[PDB]
């Protein structure tokens, strides 16, 4: 390709009636910067009209609309694909070039756009129009189940995926999507290894995607209190071996170092996790994983700013702007006034999309008690505040009652709430104290204002 | 059918699973396996 580039830089300057030179330009530049391919097809479109009145072949308008489909010019790519269809339809004598296949690819990109254009129905219908004419196509059959997978992992999505595998079992994408099915319900933790070791045969082998999916399903087994039973350490070492293997065969595999740093962080080697995650960040910080792992390293310094900055950055996407796990990661070192009082707000925002979780209803009570004792212990606080603190304490006590009746917990029994209830009772006694303090300060301020008013009467 | 070989032969797919897992940057493993071994040597 370097030689092709250097030859194209020689044909680009001189003009020996260049006609297809920009085509060969864009044919290389579609891996490189997408704008260069666009500029080449833009000039190639008009260069094909001066010699004769000849319409643009559908293949170029198709490739240019496929370029624009990766961009935000989705409607413009849509017009390109429409025009490619109309043009490829006009090719009644191009049976050698198979105008039909050109229309096929154009319609595929068009349904992929409608899928992407918030118009799942048009994508469904176009994909079915390919099915009705060519059921031997895979991606039309897969993207259809993808659309239904939005509504749920149990609709004909799953069926069409399996059926796709039966027609083409040697299709690594369909198979990977199979294993992706089990990732919804992680109850198939250990049993996924069999389904993942199917196409690990040497004809497929060096499939880094399977190897990493293996290390991921193996990493999920970490974060267990059974580490002292010499059980999680072996799992760590095994996943580390997987990662070292996918490293030797792919030094650029950023997910390999991603999991290496994950296991190092589980080792508590957060600085070794820090800088490996930093190298991942340098290579591509965009991936959702780094915004979490890096923030979880920065928050581990107990002092943090970047952590909440990175938590904000990952939530910028529309995927889960309302999110519980991010606030559970963030609800840490909650003792600063802007951490206590603000984290109530973010806990409420999370709970208003997920009120059924026990952990939100528990942490909101813990932060309530943290604040209430931050003003009902010693503080010469504002007067209104001691009225408000007993209200918050009452609601905390109500939650403490309500939580105790719930059966299921965060994989950890909440039987230890008795100490929260005791803290509640003694904070109530401190409230009954500090409201006396409140009245004494009230009379103090009243006599202060009176003794000032008299001075003004003197003047 | 021929529609399969008609399309799979002209298609010019540029990205795939592995190309996402690979860094496009110059971070090979010389700067990665180094610390990976050093921390094992601390143990």
């Amino acid at each position: 390709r370097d030689i092709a580039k250097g030859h194209l830089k020689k044909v680009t300057e001189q003009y020996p009636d260049d006609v297809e030179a920009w085509i060969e330009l864009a044919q290389i530049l579609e891996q490189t910067d997408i704008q260069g391919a666009l500029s080449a097809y833009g000039t190639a479109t008009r260069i094909l009209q001066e010699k004769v009145q000849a319409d643009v072949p559908p293949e170029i308008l198709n490739n240019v609309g496929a370029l624009h489909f990766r961009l935000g010019n989705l409607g413009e790519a849509k017009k390109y694909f429409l025009a490619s269809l109309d043009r490829a339809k006009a090719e009644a004598e191009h049976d050698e070039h198979y105008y039909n296949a050109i229309s096929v690819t154009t319609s595929y990109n068009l349904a992929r756009l409608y899928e992407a254009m918030c118009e799942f129905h048009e994508a469904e219908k176009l994909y079915k129009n390919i099915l009705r004419e060519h059921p031997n196509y895979v991606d039309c059959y897969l993207r259809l189940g993808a659309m239904a997978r939005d509504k749920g992992n149990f609709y004909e999505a799953s069926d069409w995926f399996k059926e796709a595998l039966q027609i083409n079992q040697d299709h690594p994408d369909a198979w990977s999507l199979i294993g992706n099915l089990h990732l919804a319900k992680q109850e198939w933790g250990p049993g996924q290894k069999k389904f993942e070791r199917i196409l690990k045969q040497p004809s497929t082998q060096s499939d880094t995607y399977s190897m990493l999916a293996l290390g991921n399903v193996w990493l999920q087994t970490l974060h267990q209190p059974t580490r002292d039973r010499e059980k999680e350490k072996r799992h760590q070492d095994r996943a580390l071996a997987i990662y070292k293997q996918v490293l030797r065969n792919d030094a650029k595999n950023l997910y390999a170092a991603n999991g290496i740093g994950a296991v190092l962080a589980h080792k508590g080697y957060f600085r070794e996790a820090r800088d490996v995650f930093a190298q991942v960040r340098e290579a591509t910080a965009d991936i959702s994983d780094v915004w979490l792992n890096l923030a979880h390293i920065y928050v581990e310094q107990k002092q943090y700013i970047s952590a909440v900055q990175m938590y904000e950055n990952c939530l910028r996407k529309f995927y889960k702007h309302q999110n519980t796990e991010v606030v559970l990661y963030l609800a840490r070192a909650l003792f600063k006034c802007g951490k206590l009082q603000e984290c109530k707000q973010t806990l409420l925002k999370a709970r208003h999309v997920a009120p059924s979780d026990t952990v939100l209803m528990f942490n909101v009570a813990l932060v309530l008690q943290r604040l209430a004792t931050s003003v009902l212990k010693d503080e010469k606080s504002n007067l209104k505040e001691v009225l408000n603190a007993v209200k918050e304490l009452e609601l905390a006590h109500r939650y403490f009652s309500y939580l105790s009746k719930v059966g299921d917990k965060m994989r950890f029994d909440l039987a230890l709430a008795a100490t929260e209830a005791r803290q509640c009772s003694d904070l109530l006694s401190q409230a009954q104290y500090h409201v006396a303090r409140a009245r004494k300060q009230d009379e103090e301020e009243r006599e202060l204002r009176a003794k000032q008013e008299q001075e003004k009467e003197l003047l | 059918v021929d529609v399969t070989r008609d399309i799979v032969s002209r298609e010019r797919v540029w990205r795939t699973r592995t190309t996402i897992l690979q860094s496009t940057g110059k971070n090979f493993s010389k700067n990665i396996f180094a610390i990976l071994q050093s921390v094992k040597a601390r143990e």
Binding site: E30, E59, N62, N63, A66, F69, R70, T105, Y108, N109, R112, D139, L142, R143, D173, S176, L177, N180, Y209, A213, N216, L219, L222, H223, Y255, N258, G259, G261, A262, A265, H266, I287, S288, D289, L292, N293, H296, L328, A331, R332, A333, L334, N363, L366, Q369, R370, T373, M410, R411, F412, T419 | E11, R12, V13, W14, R15, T16, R17, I20, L21
Partner: peptide, 25 residues
């Protein structure tokens, strides 16, 4: 307070989906 906030802090990393590239020709 007697404890910090309870948290199942786990260093997770997902995998990407198949890119389903547009079929350039």
């Amino acid at each position: 307070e007697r404890s910090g906030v309870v948290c199942r802090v786990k260093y997770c990393n997902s995998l990407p989906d198949i890119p389903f590239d547009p079929k350039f020709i």
